Amino acid sequence: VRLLESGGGLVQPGGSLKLSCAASGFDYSRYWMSWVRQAPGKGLKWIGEINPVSSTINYTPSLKDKFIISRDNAKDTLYLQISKVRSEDTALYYCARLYYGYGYWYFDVWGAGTTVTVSSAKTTPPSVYPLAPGSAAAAASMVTLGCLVKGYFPEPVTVTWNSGSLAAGVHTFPAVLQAALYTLSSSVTVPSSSWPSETVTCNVAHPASSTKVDKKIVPRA
Amino acid sequence: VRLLESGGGLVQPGGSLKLSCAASGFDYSRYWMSWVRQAPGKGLKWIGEINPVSSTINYTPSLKDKFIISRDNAKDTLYLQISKVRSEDTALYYCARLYYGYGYWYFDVWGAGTTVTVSSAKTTPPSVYPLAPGSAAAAASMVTLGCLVKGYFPEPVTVTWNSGSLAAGVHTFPAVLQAALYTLSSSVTVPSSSWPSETVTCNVAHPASSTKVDKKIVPRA
Amino acid sequence: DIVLTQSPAIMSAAPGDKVTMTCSASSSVSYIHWYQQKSGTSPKRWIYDTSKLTSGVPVRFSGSGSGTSYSLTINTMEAEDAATYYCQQWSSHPQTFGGGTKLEILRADAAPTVSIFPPSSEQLTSGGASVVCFLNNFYPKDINVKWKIDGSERQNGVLNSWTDQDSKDSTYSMSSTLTLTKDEYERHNSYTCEATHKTSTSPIVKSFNRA
Amino acid sequence: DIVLTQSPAIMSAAPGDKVTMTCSASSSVSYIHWYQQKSGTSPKRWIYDTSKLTSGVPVRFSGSGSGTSYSLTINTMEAEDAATYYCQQWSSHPQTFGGGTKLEILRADAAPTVSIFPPSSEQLTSGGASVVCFLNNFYPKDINVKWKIDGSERQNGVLNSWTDQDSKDSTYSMSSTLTLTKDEYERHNSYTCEATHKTSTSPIVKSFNRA
Amino acid sequence: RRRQLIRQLLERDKTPLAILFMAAVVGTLVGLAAVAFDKGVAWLQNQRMGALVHTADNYPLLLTVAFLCSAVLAMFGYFLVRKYAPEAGGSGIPEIEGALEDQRPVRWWRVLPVKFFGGLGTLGGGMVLGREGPTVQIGGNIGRMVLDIFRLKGDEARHTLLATGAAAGLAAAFNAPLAGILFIIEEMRPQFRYTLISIKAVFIGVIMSTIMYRIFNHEVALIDVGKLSDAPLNTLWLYLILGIIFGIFGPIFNKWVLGMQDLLHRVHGGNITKWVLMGGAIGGLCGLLGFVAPATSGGGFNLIPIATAGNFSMGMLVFIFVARVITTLLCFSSGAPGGIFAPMLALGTVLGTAFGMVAVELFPQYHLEAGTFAIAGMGALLAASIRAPLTGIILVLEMTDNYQLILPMIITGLGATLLAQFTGGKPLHSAILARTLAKQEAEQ
Amino acid sequence: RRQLIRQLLERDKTPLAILFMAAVVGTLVGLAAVAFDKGVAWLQNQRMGALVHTADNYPLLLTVAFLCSAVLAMFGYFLVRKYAPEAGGSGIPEIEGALEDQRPVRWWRVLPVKFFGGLGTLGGGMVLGREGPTVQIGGNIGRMVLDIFRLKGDEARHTLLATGAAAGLAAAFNAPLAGILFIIEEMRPQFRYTLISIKAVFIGVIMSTIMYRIFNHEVALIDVGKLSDAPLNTLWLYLILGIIFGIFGPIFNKWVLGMQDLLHRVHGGNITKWVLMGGAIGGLCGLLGFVAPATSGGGFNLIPIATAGNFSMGMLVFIFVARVITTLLCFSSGAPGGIFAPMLALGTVLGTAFGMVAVELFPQYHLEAGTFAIAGMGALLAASIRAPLTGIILVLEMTDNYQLILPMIITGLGATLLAQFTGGKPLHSAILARTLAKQEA
Ligand SMILES: [Br-]
Ligand SMILES: [Br-]
C-alpha cells in the first residue's frame, strides 16, 4: 500500500487550492481518512478527518469554510480544499489512513507528502555557478568542489553531481530565503587524482520554472 | 449499474485484439462475468464465463487458445483476446454479468456491445453532408431535414440530433456497403415555426477512427 | 450440446391478440430464460426460471413449459412488444440460445411522407453527387420507389435502405439515394423521386429544379 | 485541549546504549502512540497504545506510563535509530501530537575540512559576487564563522546554512556565503574565513587573494 | 444411580424414526402455511395502497377510505376470534407455552382457520403486530394436528412435535432457522420439570420449513442494513449503559401492556359487540396512520433500515418512539391476534439509534456510527420485556448479519436482563400465562 | 396448577450471589485460557527457532525436531500419570460427569497438572486441541471459587461448574455463542432436570471473551473471506456430503476407542512405558511438523489453505489419511488435550475433496469447492461427537459465512441422522460410560 498525495505548490495569499490524495494497495472504504500538516520545522497538527460514508467530517478548532474535506470512493481519492489561504498554511501536507487497538485511534499509514507555499513572490529560475577552487590552493589528497544555485523561487531544486554517479561524498545544504528569493550550494569531494583530469559536472533542475541545467566545473587559468 | 464494453473495430484476418468491458454500480466481485456474440442479423452465441477469483474459466467448444477471457478486480474490468481471426468472428460482442433464481444461471445485466470487423480494408472517417430542403420548400406544418453520412468503414456510426435534445422525430437508416465502403442517412422532423428560425445540428460520431462531426443544416443560399 | 429451436421465426399480430411463441429443445431442459431484444438495443432479461418476470416487466407477459417444450406468452399484446425474443437454457452445459422469434405488429394503414434533397454544395466539391429521398412512417412495409431524371427511367446505381418497425407507432420508413459523377448530375435539370404505395393508387411524386 | 510536551528537546547517545524520551500532557491521557520520522520521509507508526510494537519494529524499543507522563525507550540504541520520535494522543478530542524529540548520534569529535571559493567568472558578469565557505564533516555542531575582507571583520550580508547529521558518519557541515556587489567586491582584496570549533584553541583560517 | 446412568448415556441421542419423519412433515406444513400467510398479508396491504390511488384527490375522502379499510378488516378479525376461538386472541405464544405444560388445550380444528384468516385481517389492515404470534401458534397447532391425525402415542411425540411446529413457525417468520430452535429451548419448553423433547427432531422440522419459505421468498431479505463498522474495545462500556436503560424500561413496558389489557376490558365488558367495534376502531386508527405518518403504524420492519442508516432526525425519532409505544400497547393489549416480537424490534432500534446519536456527538474520539447502537438495542427490548436474551441475540444476528457486533449485542442484551431483574419485572410471556391461568382458578 | 403459577411468576430469578460469582469465574478462566494460549505459542516458537540453529546437516535437524516434541510430550504424560490421572485425554467427559455428581473435581490437582501438562503436548506440536485443556481447566476454576467461598446449595455447585466450562470453551475459539450452546446440548445433566441458571452462564462467557479479546484482538484463528452463496438446486449435494460424514462418523469413534485399548497393551498402565511411548508419539509429530506439517499440529493453519482450493486432489487424500493416523495416535494415547480442533480440520479436508469432485461433475451449478469445505468443517463434530447445534454455531462464529447456514445445517444434520442409523454413539458419552463402568467393574 502506497499513499500518493499531489496538488501542492505555490499559491497567492487570499487564493485557494485543492490538494488531491490517490490510494492503492487496499480497499479504500471501511477506512476513516485524515489530513495532517506539518508547518516547516514545527509540531505536526491535525486538520480533520472523514469517515467512509462521508456522514461525518470533523475538522480542527479552526474557523468556518477554511477546510473542505471530502472523498470519492469510486476513483479512490480523498480531497482537501483550502480557501482564503494565508502564510500559516505554507506547510507540508499528509493524508493518512486511520486505525486503532484498544480503541484510542492512531494514524495508521502516512503518504509521502506535498508542499504548499503561500507567498506573493513570483516563480523565477535559478542561476547556476561553479565554485572551482582557487589558484592560491594546495592540490591535496581530497579536492572539494561545488555549485551555487542562486536566486530562484519556490522550492525545491534537485542538484545531483555527474548524473548521481558521483553519489559518494556530496552535500546539498538547505536553501535560504532572502528578499523573496532562495539560495543553496552543493558540494562534492573528489580525490586529487580524479579532478581536472576527469570531468566533474553538476546537474541542477528546478522544475518550478522548467529549468534543467548542467554546469561543468573547470579548474582556474 | 452499467457495463461498457470497448476496443473492437478493424482487425487484419488472422490478427488479434483485446476487448475490455468495464463495470460500475455494483460490487464487481461477487459476480461471475461472461461474453456473448451476435454476428450481424443473427442469434446469440456464448463465448465463455469466468468467476470472481479467476479460478474457473470455461469456454465454448473451440480451439486451444482461440479465446482468452480474463478479468482484473482492481480496475473493475473484464477482458477478451481473439487470435487467428477468420471471418466467422466478425460480430458484436456483449459482456454480461451472471446470476440465478432457483439455480440455473442466466445472463443478467448485459452490456451495450462492441463491433469487431475482420477485413483487409482500411479505417476511413465518414464524410458528412447536410440534406436541407431545396429553396422551393413548400413549408407545411412541419419540416424534414436530414444529413447524409457517406464513405466510412467499418461500422457503426451514431447520429443524434442537437446533442440528443431532439429525440422524438428522428430516423436513422441502416448502412449499405457500396463495395468496401458504408453509407447512411438520418432524417429529422421539426415544427416549421422553429426552423430556419433556430439551430438544427446533426452529430455524426464514428468511433472506429475516433471522430465526431457536427453539421449545422443551413437553408440554401 | 443442447439445440434449442424457436417456433415462429417471424410472427405478425395486432395489439389485443393473445400471443404465444415457442422454444423446443433436443434433450431435456428445465428453467429456461427469455430475452427481449428490441431494434438496436441489447438483449434484456425478460422472463427467467421459466415463469418469473424480471422487475418491471408488464404483467401482460407470462412464461411456462417443461421437459422439451417451453413457451412465452403475451396476453393481449401491445405494440411496444415489437421485439425479437430469445429463449436460453443453462440446465446442461454449455448453455445455448434459441434462433429467436421476431414479433411484428399489425396496425391500420399510414401513407408515406416524402422528402427530396439535392446534392449539398459541399458534396459537389468532392466530384460526387447524391440525390436523397426520405419516405417516412408508412404502413405496410411494401413500397416501390422509382427515379426519373428529366422524365426518363434511371435504374443505374440507386440505393435503398429501410428501418425496422417502430417500437411505439409501429410504422416503417425508407430512404433512396441516387449517385452521379459531378458533371453527370450537372448535365440535367429536373430530378424526381416517385413513390408508389398501397395507401393511394396514384404514385406520389416529389421533385427539385437545378435551375 | 491536550498539550503533549516531549522533554529531551534534541539529544545524543552512542550506538548500543540506553535511550529514554519523556512526553507529559496538560489534562489526562490514555494509550498514546509513537511515530518515527527520518529526514525527508513519511512519518511511521512505531509504538502504539501506551506500548505495543508495530510489525517490523526492532524489539529494542518500548513504552509505558499513566495519565500525565509516558515514555519511549531504546535498550541498545543503534545506527538506524537516527530519527525523530513524536508522541501523539487521541484519548481526548481533538487529537494532538508533541513537539517531537529528535534522536542524534554522539561520535568522535572532529575538526572541519575547510574550503573557500572565489565568485564565479559567470556570476561577476552579472553584478553580484558571492564568496563561499564550506565547512565539511565535524562533531559536535556548535561552531562560529567570521569573515575578514581586506583583513577587516564584517557581519552583514552573510548566510550560513547547516546540514543535519550524516548517515555515512554522523558529522555536520555548514556553508557560509557572503554576497557583495561586483563594485563593492572589486574594491577590496584579502577575503578570509575563520572557523571556531571545540577541537582547537586557534580558529581555522582559510582564505584567498584577488591579486 | 450410577448403574442406571451408564445405561442412559449409551442410549443418548436416539430418537425413534417415527418422530423424526413426522417432524419432517410438520415443518413442511408450517412452512407452506407460514408462506401462504405472508402472501396474504402482502396482498391485503396492496389493495389498501391501491384503493388509495383510486380515490386520489379529496383529502378528507381518502383519509376516510384508509381508516374505514383497516377498520373493516380489524373487525372481521376480532369477530372471527371472539366468536369461534377465544384462545387465539393476543400473541399465541403464551397459549402454546401452556400446552407444553399440559394446562391449555390445543383446539386445532378451531384455531388453524381462526388465527390464519383472522390474522390476515389485523395484519393486512396494517396494525402494529407481528407475524410470530400467528405462526408460532399456527405452527404448534399444525404439530398437534398431525399427532392427532396419525394418532401417535406417548409423552415424547406430543411434546416434541408441538415444539418443532412452534419452532418451524417462528423460523419461517423471520427466515431464522437458528433462533427458532434457540427459542424453544429458552422459553418454550416446560421450564421447571424435565421434558423429553428431542432436539434433532425440532431441527429437521425447522429446516424443512425454512427450505419451504426460501422456495417462495428467495432473493430478498426482511431487513438489509449492509455491513456496519466494528466496535473497538474502549467502546463497550457504552453498550452496558444502553442495556441499563433498556433494563429499567423493560419492566415498565410490561406494566402497561398488562394494565392496558385491564383498562381495555372495562371498555367492552367482555361483550362481543363493543369489542369488535372497539376493534375496527383501533384497527382503523392504524390504517389511517399508515398514511399520515406510516412510521407509527405497520409491523416496523420497514423503518429499521431507514433508522439504522441515521436518516431520521433526533426529533423524528423521539416522535416515532412515543407514537409506537402508544400503538403497540393499543393493538396488542386490546387482544387482537398477532405477536409483539416485531414491534419490539422496532422500538429497540429506534431507541437504540437515539442513544447512538447522543453517543456519536458526545464522543468523537470513539469514531462511532450510531447504526451499531441501533443494532445492539434492536434485540434489547426482547431481552428486558420478554426475558429471552439468547433468542433475541441470535434473532438479530440471523437478520442483520453483523457478527462483528456480537460483543456489543450480548453486553447490551445482558445489561437488559440484569436490570429487568433487579427492578422486579417479569418475563412478559409468563406473566401472561400466569394471569390467564390464575383466572381459570379464580372463578370456582 | 396452583403450584405452576407460583413458579411462573418467580421464573428467571437467580440470586445476586451466584450472578456475581459467575462474573469472577469467567474473568478467571479468561485470563487462564489466554495465559495458556500464550504459552503454546512460545513453545512452538522455540522449536522453530532451534531448527534454524542447526540449519544444515539434514539428518541432524530431523533429529532436533523429533527430540524436542519428544521431550515435551514426556514431560506432559508424566505430570499427568504422577499427580493427576483424571486429567488425561479430553477433559470434557470428566466435567460432564461432575455435573451428574459422579466424578470429583480435584481442582487443587488438575489446575496445575492440565495447564502445564498441556503446554507440553500442545507445544511439541501434537495433533490435539485447546478445548480439552480449557473446558476442564475452566470447570475446575468453577469449583475452586465454590469451594474458596463456601457457597451453599445444588444451584451454585452446578451453575458455577457449568459457566466455568463454557467460558473455557469460548475463550478456546473466541466463540461466546458456541460456549453457551454447548452447555445446553452436551454439558448439562442430560436426563434429570437441573437448576443451572442460563443468565449466569452468560455473564461468565462474556467476561472471559472480553478477557481473551484484551490480549488476542486484531487477529482471528481462521480467516476464509466471504465465500460465494449456495443456490437452492445445489442443496441436495450437501445432504449427500452429510451422508458420507454420517457413515464415517461412527467408524472414527470405533477407532478412537479401539486405539485407546490397543495402546494400553503397549504400556500395561505403567508410568514409564507410557511416558516413553508418549514422547515417542509426541516426537513423531514434531518431526512431521517439518517434513510435511499439514499432517501435524492442531490443524487451524491448513483450513484456510485447503478451503481456497490450493491443494491438488492428491495432496488432499494424503493429508487426510495422514491425519486420521495422527489424531488417533495422539488422542487415544491419553495425552492431555481435546479432539475438537483436529476434527474441524478433518472435516474441512474431506469437504474440499467432495467439493472438487463436485465442481467438475457439475459445471452448470457454478460451484466453488470452498463451500463444501465449510459445510463439512463441523460435520465430523456432528457425526462423531453428536453435537450438531454447537458445531454449526462454532463454524459460524469462526468463518462467518452466514449465507451458508442452510448447507451447513443440512450437511450437519445428514450427519447426525446417518450416525444414528448406523449405530454410533456420542463420542463424549461413550468415553464417560467407559470410564464410569470401569469404576464399577
Ligand atoms: Br397474548
Ligand atoms: Br477423554
PDB file of C-alpha atoms and ligand atoms in Angstrom, chain E residues 89-92 94 261 332 432, ligand 1:
ATOM      1  CA  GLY E  89     -56.548 -13.690  20.690  1.00  0.00           C
ATOM      2  CA  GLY E  90     -53.394 -11.983  21.816  1.00  0.00           C
ATOM      3  CA  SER E  91     -49.975 -13.253  20.809  1.00  0.00           C
ATOM      4  CA  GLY E  92     -50.430 -17.036  20.855  1.00  0.00           C
ATOM      5  CA  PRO E  94     -48.318 -17.926  25.931  1.00  0.00           C
ATOM      6  CA  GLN E 261     -55.310  -5.278  28.948  1.00  0.00           C
ATOM      7  CA  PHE E 332     -51.575  -5.954  21.441  1.00  0.00           C
ATOM      8  CA  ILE E 432     -49.455 -13.590  30.658  1.00  0.00           C
TER       9      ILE E 432
HETATM   10 BR    BR G   1     -51.088 -12.954  24.500  1.00  0.00          BR
END
